[PDB]
Design a binder for this molecule. Structure first.
Ligand SMILES: C/C(=C\S(=O)(=O)N[C@H]1CCN([C@@H](C)C(=O)N2CCOCC2)C1=O)c1ccc(Cl)s1
Lengths: 52, 232
């Protein structure tokens, strides 16, 4: 296991391999964090989160 | 849903319920955005006129909001004979207000869903369908964790054709499954505490029968179609 197959490339959501390295990205309503791995909700009620 | 557990406050906020003229639920759906609901094309024949209810966990009590449908987008290749292409997108007349118990499920990117979501051990199915093969619709929203089933194993178990637009989930003998009235509802897969839409409850040979599994529309097969349906 390497790149995306190693714990999802440390990405919160989507992981793709471009050239020989990890590129992370997020679903609509999320912005990729400064670290290029975490996905930050852009506002209230982001998709896919339980409303607990 | 046969078996499983009741959805607690906030646990299944993407659930939608299609209700007839009599305000009775007959299928589920998944909230994709403020204007769009994902459901099964076969549900569109089970009522002549219908509306969509969101935020309801208990049909005997009024967060809930009833929404009329503006546009029904049925997959033109849906076939009543095999339930292949069992998918439809509904554009609502008024946008949904997100709140506790009302929020969209995420749509994943195709390749990543295939490699990362569909390879997880389980997904979650939910709905207000029957709680026994013969029975009344549930008045409470239920959910159930369902193991992904090996593609070869489910073809072997099936009396009917399993196409590439379908996948199987559930248990061989354990008595838990989706059931009548759950069709159209969500099958979601959790990844790092984010829930992604992975299937649409489609069909089964009865409910929770030994050696039979639940059959779901494979959402990864229709991501571009869904995206395109939401743009126009
Ligand atoms: C809706 C349902 C269980 S049911 O007993 O309410 N309805 C059955 C009756 C017969 N069928 C199938 C075999 C059927 O009639 N098909 C499928 C193949 O194409 C023609 C129509 C059902 O879906 C489901 C069980 C598990 C999932 Cl997932 S949903």
């Amino acid at each position: 296991r390497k790149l995306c197959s190693l714990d999802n490339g440390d990405c919160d959501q989507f992981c793709h391999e471009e050239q020989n390295s990890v590129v992370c990205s997020c679903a609509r309503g999320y912005t990729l964090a400064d670290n290029g791995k975490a996905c930050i909700p852009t506002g209230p009620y982001p998709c896919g989160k339980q409303t607990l | 849903i046969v078996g499983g557990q009741e959805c607690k406050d906030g646990e299944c906020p993407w659930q939608a319920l299609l209700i007839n003229e009599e305000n009775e639920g007959f299928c589920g759906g998944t909230i994709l955005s403020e204007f769009y609901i994902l459901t099964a094309a076969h549900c569109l024949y089970q009522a002549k006129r219908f509306k969509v209810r969101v935020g309801d966990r208990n049909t005997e009590q009024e967060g809930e909001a009833v929404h009329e449908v503006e546009v029904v987008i049925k997959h033109n290749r849906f076939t009543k004979e095999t339930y292949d292409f069992d998918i439809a997108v509904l554009r609502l007349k008024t946008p949904i207000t997100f709140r506790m118990n009302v929020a969209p499920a995420c749509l994943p990117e195709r390749d990543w869903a295939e490699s990362t979501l569909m390879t997880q051990k389980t997904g979650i199915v939910s709905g207000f369908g029957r709680t026994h093969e013969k029975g009344r619709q549930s008045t409470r929203l239920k959910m159930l964790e369902v193991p992904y089933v090996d593609r070869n194993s489910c073809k072997l178990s099936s009396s009917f054709i399993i196409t590439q637009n379908m996948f199987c989930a559930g248990y061989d003998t354990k008595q838990e499954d989706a059931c009548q009235g759950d069709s159209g509802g969500p099958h979601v897969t959790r990844f790092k505490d984010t829930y992604f839409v992975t299937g649409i409850v489609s069909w089964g040979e009865g409910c929770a029968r030994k050696g039979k599994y639940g059959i779901y529309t494979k959402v990864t097969a229709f991501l571009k179609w869904i995206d395109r349906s939401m743009k126009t």
